[PDB]
Amino acid sequence: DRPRFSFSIAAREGKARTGTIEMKRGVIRTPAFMPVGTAATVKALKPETVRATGADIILGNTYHLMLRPGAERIAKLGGLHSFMGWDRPILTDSGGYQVMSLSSLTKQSEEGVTFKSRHMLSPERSIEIQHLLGSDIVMAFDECTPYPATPSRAASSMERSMRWAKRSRDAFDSRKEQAENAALFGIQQGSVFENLRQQSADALAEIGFDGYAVGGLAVGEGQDEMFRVLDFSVPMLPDDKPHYLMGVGKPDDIVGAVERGIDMFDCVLPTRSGRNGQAFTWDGPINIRNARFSEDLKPLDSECHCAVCQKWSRAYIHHLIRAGEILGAMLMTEHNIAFYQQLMQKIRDSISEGRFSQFAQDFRARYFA
Amino acid sequence: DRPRFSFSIAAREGKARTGTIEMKRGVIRTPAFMPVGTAATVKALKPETVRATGADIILGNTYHLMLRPGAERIAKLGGLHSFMGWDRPILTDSGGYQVMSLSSLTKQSEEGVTFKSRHMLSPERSIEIQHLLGSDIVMAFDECTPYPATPSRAASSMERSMRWAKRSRDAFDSRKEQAENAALFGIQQGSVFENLRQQSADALAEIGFDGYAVGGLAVGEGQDEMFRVLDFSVPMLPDDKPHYLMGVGKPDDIVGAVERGIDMFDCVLPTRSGRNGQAFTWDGPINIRNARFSEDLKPLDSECHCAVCQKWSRAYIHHLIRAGEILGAMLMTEHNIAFYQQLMQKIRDSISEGRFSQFAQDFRARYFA
Ligand SMILES: CNc1nc2c(CC[C@H]3O[C@@H](OC)[C@H](OC)[C@@H]3O)c3nc(N)[nH]c(=O)c3cc2[nH]1
Numbered sequence: 001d002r003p004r005f006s007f008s009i010a011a012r013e014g015k016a017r018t019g020t021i022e023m024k025r026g027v028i029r030t031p032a033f034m035p036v037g038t039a040a041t042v043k044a045l046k047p048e049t050v051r052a053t054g055a056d057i058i059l060g061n062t063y064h065l066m067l068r069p070g071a072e073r074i075a076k077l078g079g080l081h082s083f084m085g086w087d088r089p090i091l092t093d094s095g096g097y098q099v100m101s102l103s104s105l106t107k108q109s110e111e112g113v114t115f116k117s118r119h120m121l122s123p124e125r126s127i128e129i130q131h132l133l134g135s136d137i138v139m140a141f142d143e144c145t146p147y148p149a150t151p152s153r154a155a156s157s158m159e160r161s162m163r164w165a166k167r168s169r170d171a172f173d174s175r176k177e178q179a180e181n182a183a184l185f186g187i188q189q190g191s192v193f194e195n196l197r198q199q200s201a202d203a204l205a206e207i208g209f210d211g212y213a214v215g216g217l218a219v220g221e222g223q224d225e226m227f228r229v230l231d232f233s234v235p236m237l238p239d240d241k242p243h244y245l246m247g248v249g250k251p252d253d254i255v256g257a258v259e260r261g262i263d264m265f266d267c268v269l270p271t272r273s274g275r276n277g278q279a280f281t282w283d284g285p286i287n288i289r290n291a292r293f294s295e296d297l298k299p300l301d302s303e304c305h306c307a308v309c310q311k312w313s314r315a316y317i318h319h320l321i322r323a324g325e326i327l328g329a330m331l332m333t334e335h336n337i338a339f340y341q342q343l344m345q346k347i348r349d350s351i352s353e354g355r356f357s358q359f360a361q362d363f364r365a366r367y368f369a
Numbered sequence: 370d371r372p373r374f375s376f377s378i379a380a381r382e383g384k385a386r387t388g389t390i391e392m393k394r395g396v397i398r399t400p401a402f403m404p405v406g407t408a409a410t411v412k413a414l415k416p417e418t419v420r421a422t423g424a425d426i427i428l429g430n431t432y433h434l435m436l437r438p439g440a441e442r443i444a445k446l447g448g449l450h451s452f453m454g455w456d457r458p459i460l461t462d463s464g465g466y467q468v469m470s471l472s473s474l475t476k477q478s479e480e481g482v483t484f485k486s487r488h489m490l491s492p493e494r495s496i497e498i499q500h501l502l503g504s505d506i507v508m509a510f511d512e513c514t515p516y517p518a519t520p521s522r523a524a525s526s527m528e529r530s531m532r533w534a535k536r537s538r539d540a541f542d543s544r545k546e547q548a549e550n551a552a553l554f555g556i557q558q559g560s561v562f563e564n565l566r567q568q569s570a571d572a573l574a575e576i577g578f579d580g581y582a583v584g585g586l587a588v589g590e591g592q593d594e595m596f597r598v599l600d601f602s603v604p605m606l607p608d609d610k611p612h613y614l615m616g617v618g619k620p621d622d623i624v625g626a627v628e629r630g631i632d633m634f635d636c637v638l639p640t641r642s643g644r645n646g647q648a649f650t651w652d653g654p655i656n657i658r659n660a661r662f663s664e665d666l667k668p669l670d671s672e673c674h675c676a677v678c679q680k681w682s683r684a685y686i687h688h689l690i691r692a693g694e695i696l697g698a699m700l701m702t703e704h705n706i707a708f709y710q711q712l713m714q715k716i717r718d719s720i721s722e723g724r725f726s727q728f729a730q731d732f733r734a735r736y737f738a
Pocket residue numbers: 036037038059060061093094095096097098139142143144145187214215216217218219246247248266268
């Protein structure tokens with residue numbers, strides 16, 4: 001039977017790695033893209049469809065599920081896996097992003113954050129909620145530092161997050177069933193500052209985690225800056241554990257982040273922008289609502305192996321999205337998630353074969369032609 | 370290979386019949402429920418899912434498709450079947466209901482109806498649009514008489530519909546490809562008046578059609594009145610051709626209509642009310658949004674064989690619908706359409722076995738308990 005947690009690296013090329021995370025509920029192939037299913041659903045897809053696209057793991061969110069339908073309620077109903085019908089690993093974010101994104105609803109202190117009906121999150125309560133959900137990969141309760149941030153404020157925020165990381169570790173470890181069956185990831189903060197990123201990495205490594213997320217990016221800094229920060233930040237993390245870049249991203253963001261040592265990704269882009277009419281293709285994104293697609297009999301993408309591209313035309317999907325039809329959202333979402341998984345597969349295969357740098361070059365040349 | 374059209378009756382019980390319609394694109398088991406797919410989609414379902422529920426045929430609509438995406442456009446793209454990915458029979462309504470339901474947009478004359486951007490429908494143009502869509506069962510262009518109607522106005526409307534029925538027949542017959550590959554149904558009108566229903570039936574039988582719809586019902590008259598009209602109206606139609614009750618209906622409406630000799634049904638109830646939170650069960654409809662379902666682990670219906678009832682709880686679907694999640698619409702719709710198909714299967718089997726009257730009694734006793 002599978003272990004609680006084992007990360008193995010099978011092949012490398014430069015800073016890029018490919019391998020597997022084995023967990024009780026399944027194997028996760030890395031680099032991995034994790035579809036976002038915040039409210040106990042990957043929007044517009046049955047779990048079987050999410051799996052058919054190639055996803056090994058999906059995300060839920062402590063903050064949203066705490067509010068609706070409720071963490072205790074989900075536990076009473078048998079846990080998130082049973083509730084939504086996904087039996088493979090689930091990673092749950094801790095609420096630390098919402099501490100920032102919904103800060104106007106908040107009162108913050110060293111103890112935690114109260115959101116206003118009032119709901120409280122703290123390292124202890126966040127870890128408890130993730131336990132009640134039956135999360136496989138539990139995220140430490142952090143604060144995603146706003147961008148831009150002054151060095152003083154970035155330091156204060158990071159320091160608090162590191163104290164919260166230790167509290168998260170201790171809360172997780174004290175709950176035997178959780179400690180024995182789930183994994184815990186720490187989240188590096190420090191904004192765009194190398195010295196703070198180093199202090200954060202050192203603090204997290206001293207505490208010790210099963211994996212390490214790069215937090216505080218994909219918050220408006222832009223790709224050049226994000227890549228600059230990754231250049232120095234990822235090498236600070238333990239090499240032998242997974243590296244998870246939270247919130248990233250566009251296909252080219254993912255490719256460049258893998259080149260910089262990232263193993264795991266989540267983003268709402270394929271799902272949300274799919275519902276909005278944006279389809280990803282190897283020749284770049286298209287907006288299916290555009291009149292130029294009204295009589296286009298080609299599939300969304302000419303090479304894509306997904307069920308949508310096997311069966312339906314751009315013209316039909318154009319009609320559905322223009323008409324506000326639910327099937328339009330379903331088809332766009334399935335295609336985009338499948339596209340993302342095919343990207344990850346090509347990345348994994350190219351690293352395995354020692355031709356990832358060539359893949360990255362070819363990918364960019366065509367995607368941005 | 371299958372004929373253009375052949376209706377065979379395999380078994381009877383009282384006025385009820387069960388059998389098959391064979392057409393080039395497939396066999397339709399009768400009594401049949403036909404899911405409504407007005408805008409080239411059965412809302413929230415892939416065609417494969419519609420088929421998996423047991424549907425043999427679906428409906429499209431001349432009026433809606435003429436407006437968006439356009440009839441000529443669909444023809445250019447290869448026809449409605451290819452466009453939406455449903456390769457089995459499709460019945461298209463003619464626009465005659467919209468003549469009534471959207472009458473404020475209209476200017477009516479003996480030639481046809483113009484809807485106001487202006488779009489025209491006439492017997493000739495309606496039949497042409499249905500050809501462009503590649504419809505298998507083409508409906509005559511009629512007017513659904515408003516309810517209530519005075520005897521004078523009901524007569525005038527019916528008489529015009531009968532003149533339009535002859536024009537529909539001639540338009541269909543003059544188009545060789547359509548005449549050789551599709552079927553044409555006439556629509557009986559006459560409101561709630563026996564003498565007018567008789568005149569209409571006689572006129573339609575004289576013209577001759579492949580099947581006969583009972584039009585002008587399910588327009589607010591209520592079940593007692595609808596059944597009273599069916600009692601005398603259905604026997605007026607040719608016995609050896611299918612009888613199609615347009616727009617019906619709730620499960621008990623369907624059962625009573627089959628008892629009165631109806632072979633085919635369409636209704637938006639399972640799809641539309643499903644999206645609104647109403648689930649059909651053998652113990653009557655439930656509204657899944659009700660707080661009583663928030664922690665109910667049972668499936669929507671205790672006996673239902675559908676994929677939704679095999680996998681997900683009332684509690685989960687309650688959460689999805691409350692949250693406005695697309696998957697909620699998908700799951701409710703699949704279940705309701707599957708329920709309707711299971712109802713039709715039970716009806717067909719019970720007639721075949723000579724126990725339909727007992728089935729109707731048992732069904733009602735439990736559904737209305
Ligand atoms: C978009 N860029 C981005 N996402 C980020 C997320 C996930 C948000 C999470 O919130 C929900 O979406 C709103 C999703 O929850 C499943 C998502 O994974 C982060 N989470 C934490 N805990 N800390 C961070 O520093 C952080 C930074 C991010 N940057």
